Amino acid sequence: RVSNLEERLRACMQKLACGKLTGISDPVTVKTSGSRFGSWMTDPLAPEGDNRVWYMDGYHNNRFVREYKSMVDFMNTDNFTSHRLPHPWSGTGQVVYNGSIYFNKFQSHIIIRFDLKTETILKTRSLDYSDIDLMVDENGLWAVYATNQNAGNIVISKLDPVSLQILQTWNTSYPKRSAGEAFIICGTLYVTNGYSGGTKVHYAYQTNASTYEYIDIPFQNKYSHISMLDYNPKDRALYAWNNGHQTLYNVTLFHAA
Amino acid sequence: VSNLEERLRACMQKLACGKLTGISDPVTVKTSGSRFGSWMTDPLAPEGDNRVWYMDGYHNNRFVREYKSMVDFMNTDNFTSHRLPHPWSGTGQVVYNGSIYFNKFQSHIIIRFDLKTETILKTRSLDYSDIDLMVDENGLWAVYATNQNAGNIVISKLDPVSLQILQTWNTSYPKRSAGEAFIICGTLYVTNGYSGGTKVHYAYQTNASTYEYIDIPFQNKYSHISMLDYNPKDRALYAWNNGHQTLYNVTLF
Ligand SMILES: *[C@@H]1O[C@H](CO)[C@@H](O[C@@H]2O[C@H](CO)[C@@H](O)[C@H](O)[C@H]2NC(C)=O)[C@H](O)[C@H]1NC(C)=O
Ligand SMILES: *[C@@H]1O[C@H](CO)[C@@H](O[C@@H]2O[C@H](CO)[C@@H](O)[C@H](O)[C@H]2NC(C)=O)[C@H](O)[C@H]1NC(C)=O
Ligand SMILES: *[C@@H]1O[C@H](CO)[C@@H](O[C@@H]2O[C@H](CO)[C@@H](O)[C@H](O)[C@H]2NC(C)=O)[C@H](O)[C@H]1NC(C)=O
Ligand SMILES: *[C@@H]1O[C@H](CO)[C@@H](O[C@@H]2O[C@H](CO)[C@@H](O)[C@H](O)[C@H]2NC(C)=O)[C@H](O)[C@H]1NC(C)=O
Ligand SMILES: *[C@@H]1O[C@H](CO)[C@@H](O)[C@H](O)[C@H]1NC(C)=O
Ligand SMILES: *[C@@H]1O[C@H](CO)[C@@H](O)[C@H](O)[C@H]1NC(C)=O
Ligand SMILES: [Cl-]
């Protein structure tokens, strides 16, 4: 199938162009709307003709997902379609991946896969261990959280996007309490210092080698508070919810291994 | 489809790249030919095309043996011979994308010869086995020594169609002292000699334009090696070992 090879080729090229984070560009304010907390994103596996933006206000008591037709439509207008999820989410760490929205069920360790076209829950899984951050990079679906197994320290888990089974789990040394926002680029989890004030990326955990090291990659916090910061492997950019603002960070990568 | 299948393979191979860390014990594929020669398979060949190309001698020969597959090559002496328009020199030939790239007899002339049409597609002279052509995950290469470089090995990235020199690197390694050499993921590995206890002890990364001396031993099973080339498709070192056809498995990192 031609459509299949084009998917495998695109995925391969993204992995081939993988690097380690060295620089974060200046943010471009996409839109100014919503409350203090929230999330906005696009589907990294969406077809070329699919540039839809998915938008979710708040980190609690909300079932409604906004669907904008395009990126330009999301900037200049407010014409969107409201989707009512069967369950409200918790936190701002959900992702739209391959036509489905993956989110954390309100006040629970339960991860839900919800098909946005069929309007149907496809899978439901509890970790039994924004408390849970779901994210996607060049390698697939991820889950970032914390356990009492660790000393409250951040935990990474690779998830099968269909069965939602944990494929592999990593222990980190970074305590979630002192953790700002986080994002995974090319299998390596980057952790920021805080949510408010001046923000920098000062922690990096490579999952391929199970090693961590302390870095220092500054990026201006254009506004007071950052409630979401997620990486999109297709755009090679950082999606951010910045205190009622939707901002985009360009990203540069340098590496060979 | 067929184009995407090849673009996917080219991408997957590049993704699995890494610097050489090990060379396994060789496997004797066949015992034939004179003391010098070269044998290979087209890295950009379809899955149904497992043909083995065979070139006996290093001086004034113009006949290439074509075996239908690895099986027919290993277990049979049934082959069809191709007559090249010009004799080659040395054992630094490569069969790339249906064409044989060889150095014209006693010259700096590289000839691209399509084996199906039996025609010469391109002919180019360089500035200067004197010229060794090889293929890795990145395409076609030319390795030799120049006059500007103090007899040191010189790498040139070639355009497989126009035989144009895209980029040139000058190593710090004298070709006279050099044994056989091969390119893996844009890095020239140079052996210590053709005979005795052989080992890879020089690696030049063309990407960073840097070099480092190493120590990667491998079994020179039949004492003398006149050909040693890397094939990015099956990730193995092809070798003409003193009238013997051998294969080395390679581990990267
Ligand atoms: C994303 O989801 C699509 C389906 O929406 C997957 O497409 C399937 O691809 C396989 C072969 O790769 C086919 O056998 C299936 O029939 C396809 N599904 C459908 C419904 O046609 C695609 O593989 C998914 N991609 C990832 C990375 O999970
Ligand atoms: C993450 O860390 C916890 C604790 O640091 C690990 O749990 C330990 O597991 C070992 C055997 O694997 C036991 O001997 C210890 O008694 C456990 N300690 C605790 C406090 O539970 C856990 O296995 C680690 N997981 C991963 C994936 O690294
Ligand atoms: C190997 O040879 C084939 C055949 O000539 C090349 O295929 C050509 O690909 C280009 C674009 O990639 C097309 O425009 C041509 O029509 C193709 N040729 C034919 C005959 O269909 C292929 O590109 C070559 N590969 C390399 C690496 O040189
Ligand atoms: C290089 O390694 C490959 C894989 O280990 C070898 O291919 C295997 O050959 C054995 C026979 O001893 C088979 O049982 C395996 O099934 C083969 N593997 C595959 C993936 O088909 C290959 O023979 C080795 N070649 C050399 C020259 O060492
Ligand atoms: C990122 O850089 C690209 C290339 O110049 C540009 O097209 C794009 O608008 C930039 N995006 C941001 C958010 O700066
Ligand atoms: C070595 O290569 C560099 C890079 O192109 C070039 O400037 C220099 O002249 C070369 N030296 C010799 C001796 O070839
Ligand atoms: Cl990767």
DSSP string, A11-22: HHHHHHT--EEE
- Sheet order of strands, B109-114 included: B94-96, B99-103, B109-114, B119-125
Q: Do B14 and A16 touch (CB under 8 A)?
A: yes
Nearby residues of B136 by Cβ (< 8 Å), 6 or more positions away? B183, B184, B185, B186, B230, B232
**What's the CA-to-centroid distance between B17 and ligand 5, angstroms?**
30
Nearby residues of A47 by Cβ (< 8 Å), 6 or more positions away? none
DSSP symbol at A43: -
Assess contact for B117 and B82: CB atoms under 8 A. no
Assess contact for B236 and B250: CB atoms under 8 A. yes
Look at residue B68 and give its three-state secondary structure.
coil
Q: How far apart are CA B251 and CA A251, in angstroms?
A: 33
Q: Do A8 and B8 touch (CB under 8 A)?
A: yes
Name the residue at shortest CA distance from atom 4 of ligand 5: A250
CA–CA distances in Å: residue B156 to residues A25, B106, B163, B218: 37, 19, 11, 26
What's the resolution in A?
Answer: 2.4
Could you tell me where the beta strands, DSSP code E, fall in B61-198? 63-67, 80-83, 94-96, 99-103, 109-114, 119-125, 132-136, 139-145, 152-158, 165-174, 181-183, 187-191
Nearby residues of A55 by Cβ (< 8 Å), 6 or more positions away? A34, A38, A39, A40, A65, A66, A67, A68, A74, A80
Handedness of CA A79, A82, A83, A89 (dihedral sign): positive
Q: Is A177 within 8 Å of chain B by CB?
A: no
What is the C-alpha radius of gyration for chain A, rounded to an integer number of angstroms? 17
- Going by C-alpha positions, the residue among B123, B117, B68 that lies closest to residue B101 is B123
DSSP symbol at A105: B
**What's the CA-to-centroid distance between B246 and ligand 4, angstroms?**
14
- Going by C-alpha positions, the residue among A238, A242, A245 that lies closest to residue A226 is A242
**What's the CA-to-centroid distance between B170 and ligand 6, angstroms?**
6
Pocket test for ligand 1, best of A4, A97, A139, A141 (most atoms within 8 A of CB): A4
Q: How far apart are CA B72 and CA A72, in angstroms?
A: 61
Assess contact for A242 and A222: CB atoms under 8 A. yes
Assess contact for B156 and B168: CB atoms under 8 A. yes
Experimental determination technique: X-ray
For residue B234, count other CB atoms closer than 10 A to its CB. 14
Q: Is B47 within 8 Å of chain A by CB?
A: no
CA–CA distances in Å: residue B79 to residues A35, A146, B74, B88, B195: 76, 65, 11, 20, 30
Domain ranges of chain B: 1-253
Name the residue at shortest CA distance from atom 5 of ligand 5: A250
* B chain contacts of residue A2, beta-carbon cutoff 8 Å: 1, 4
Q: How far apart are CA B97 and CA B66, in angstroms?
A: 15
CA–CA distances in Å: residue A82 to residues A38, A187, B88: 15, 33, 72
Q: With 0-12 CB in 10 A as exposed, 13-18 as middle and 19+ as buried, what is B58?
A: buried
Assess contact for A102 and A111: CB atoms under 8 A. yes
Ligand 6 is surrounded, with C-beta below 6 A, by B 148-149, 170
Residue at token pair 């007559």? B83
Distance from CA of B12 to the nearest CA of A (A): 7
* B chain contacts of residue A12, beta-carbon cutoff 8 Å: 8, 11-12, 15
Handedness of CA B50, B225, B129, B153 (dihedral sign): positive
CA–CA distances in Å: residue B120 to residues A5, A54, A244, B104, B167: 34, 57, 67, 12, 24
DSSP symbol at B206: T
